[PDB]
Amino acid sequence: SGPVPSRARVYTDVNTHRPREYWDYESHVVEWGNQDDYQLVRKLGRGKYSEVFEAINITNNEKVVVKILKPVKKKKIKREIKILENLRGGPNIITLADIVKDPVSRTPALVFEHVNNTDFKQLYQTLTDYDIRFYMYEILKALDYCHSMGIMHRDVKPHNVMIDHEHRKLRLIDWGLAEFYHPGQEYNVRVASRYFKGPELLVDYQMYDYSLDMWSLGCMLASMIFRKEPFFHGHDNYDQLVRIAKVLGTEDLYDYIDKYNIELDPRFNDILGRHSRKRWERFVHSENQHLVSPEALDFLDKLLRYDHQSRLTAREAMEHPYFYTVVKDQARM
Ligand SMILES: Brc1cccc2nn[nH]c12
Ligand SMILES: [Cl-]
Ligand SMILES: [Cl-]
């Protein structure tokens, strides 16, 4: 018969208990402002597939970031707006300041609070042990918040984390793939960037939850403490699962597939083979050993599980011994 159903271990019913308007983004009515309140200063480098500008609010001479929404379903645009409005003011969440259309092209754009175009990817292979712990804890505050608000990010990766290293400030950005969690909803598995895709995405298990973000976070942590970018380096989406299976082992993979009665794409039958679960010590060498501790490996091991239900929640992660010194230093401000 079909795949075995799954529910989030935490924040399972939070959208059900909200008014319909909170999560029913298709029925959201946007008041569209005038892009002529803003003057674009310069294009920010965000890849071939993104149009983001530094701009000035000409009324108050404030710096902002403008994101021009490349043509895409109006439903996706409402979804990102409604999620950004719901999360506005949450810890380490980017602030949506305005929603505007070009008066001529009528192209929709999002206006955000200014952040420097310094993403985590530029910094996260040069950090101290303490700074990896510090910024991981700041990312967890954003994830525990959006999860508690019934939202999964689904595109957690270094490029989507903006850091002001001088002020030790972080923002989680690009909510364009984010969704509301509803118990029993089957989601699109064609989300996230290859190297950060959870096993649920790779084996086509659609009834996933907030725990997807916790896999992505584990991939980022592994890349940082082992200085191995990316940690799971697949040629394509099929090879991605093989790269995972060569570390996590095939026994736990086939147990996962059996537990949720997953129908494994036939292409997997040749390429997964048979692999032991590897000890993390295998990835430790003289140029990363200063970032690796028993605490870091214990924490990483609890994020990188095939079974999405087994992974730490954001709040459980924030309680791990890996963050004791960060928590203590925060309480003393
Ligand atoms: Br770049 C950038 C900056 C601020 C918010 C953003 N949301 N998506 N990309 C963003
Ligand atoms: Cl990235
Ligand atoms: Cl989607």
From Swiss-Prot:
It comes from Homo sapiens (Human). Catalytic subunit of a constitutively active serine/threonine-protein kinase complex that phosphorylates a large number of substrates containing acidic residues C-terminal to the phosphorylated serine or threonine. Regulates numerous cellular processes, such as cell cycle progression, apoptosis and transcription, as well as viral infection. May act as a regulatory node which integrates and coordinates numerous signals leading to an appropriate cellular response. One of its GO terms (molecular function) is Hsp90 protein binding. Pfam families: Pkinase. This is Casein kinase II subunit alpha. The gene is CSNK2A1. Expressed in gastric carcinoma tissue and the expression gradually increases with the progression of the carcinoma (at protein level). Coiled coil: none annotated. Residues 38-323 form the Protein kinase domain. It is found in: Nucleus. Can use both ATP and GTP as phosphoryl donors. Phosphorylation by casein kinase 2 has been estimated to represent up to one quarter of the eukaryotic phosphoproteome. Casein kinase 2 has been found to be increased at protein level and up-regulated at the level of enzyme activity in the majority of cancers. However, elevated levels of casein kinase 2 are present in certain normal organs such as brain and testes. Its EC number is 2.7.11.1.
